[PDB]
Ligand binder design. Structure first.
Ligand code: NXL
Length: 250
């Protein structure tokens, strides 16, 4: 366990980072206090909800559809019968809400328990209804479910090293749709952003969680901001993560 200083890459934004190589057990941590603090996963939960949907047969492949009903949304890409791959990349809320609401709560509780997914608290299934967004809410979006960045890394490692009961076929679908292009062919990066605002504490929850493969070595990582500036989003924290990867993990 090495404490490290990645502040240069955060460019003034408050946050922390954790990278873990489970082969040679090297855990690199920037802002240990924050890395151990549980927060809403926001859209990073789509990593797990995709696997839940595959395991329960709600969806079956990166092509699978959820039966778009014509509802109007501001994001143009949400207004179509999009595939799993496109819903994941567009972070399409209605698709993932419809997917999870086809799964019984006890099945979800038991999967989160098995994964040790933070507090595993799905008690507020419908999410943070006081924000007015109605059915565009759920337990994973600034609601009852909370997970620390370290726990995110621990969960990703267990999934992608083959240490859960999820089917290998389903893990590979997830890997496929999580892959990102960082304009460096010598590292494979996979991840998912998340964005929320913690109304209680007046701070963002901005995430980028995933893994890095570079010649035999694999690093599981979570980068997290808790800045008070509402302009700090998941996508911005993903840029910070990419800078860290290129600087220190190339
Ligand atoms: C998930 O965090 N969300 C869904 C969507 N995409 O977020 S992302 O760009 O950080 O990946 C919009 C923000 C957020 C939400 N409000 O539901």
């Amino acid at each position: 366990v090495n404490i490290v200083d990645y502040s240069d890459c955060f460019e003034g934004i408050s946050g922390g980072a954790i990278f873990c190589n489970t082969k040679n057990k090297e855990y690199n941590i920037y802002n240990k206090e924050l890395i151990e603090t549980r927060r809403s996963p926001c859209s990073t939960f789509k990593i797990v909800s995709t696997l839940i949907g595959l395991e329960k047969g709600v969806i079956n492949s990166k092509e699978s559809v959820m039966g778009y009903d014509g509802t109007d949304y501001p994001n143009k890409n949400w207004n179509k019968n999009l595939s799993l791959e496109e819903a994941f990349k567009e972070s399409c809320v209605w698709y993932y809400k419809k997917l999870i609401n086809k799964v019984d709560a006890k099945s979800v509780q038991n999967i989160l328990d098995d994964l040790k997914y933070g507090n595993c608290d799905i008690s507020e299934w419908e999410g943070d209804l006081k924000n007015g967004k109605g059915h565009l809410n759920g337990f994973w979006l600034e609601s009852s479910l909370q997970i620390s960045p370290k726990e995110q890394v621990q969960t990703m490692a267990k999934i992608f090293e083959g240490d859960t009961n999820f089917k290998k076929e389903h893990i590979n679908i997830l890997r496929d749709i999580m892959a990102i292009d960082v304009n460096d062919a010598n590292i494979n990066v996979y991840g998912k952003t998340g964005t929320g605002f913690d109304e209680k504490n007046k701070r963002v929850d901005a995430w980028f969680v995933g893994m890095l493969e570079r010649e035999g070595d694999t690093y599981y990582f979570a980068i997290k901001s808790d800045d008070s500036n509402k302009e700090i989003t998941g996508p911005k924290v993903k840029e910070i993560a990419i800078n860290i990867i290129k600087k220190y993990y190339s």
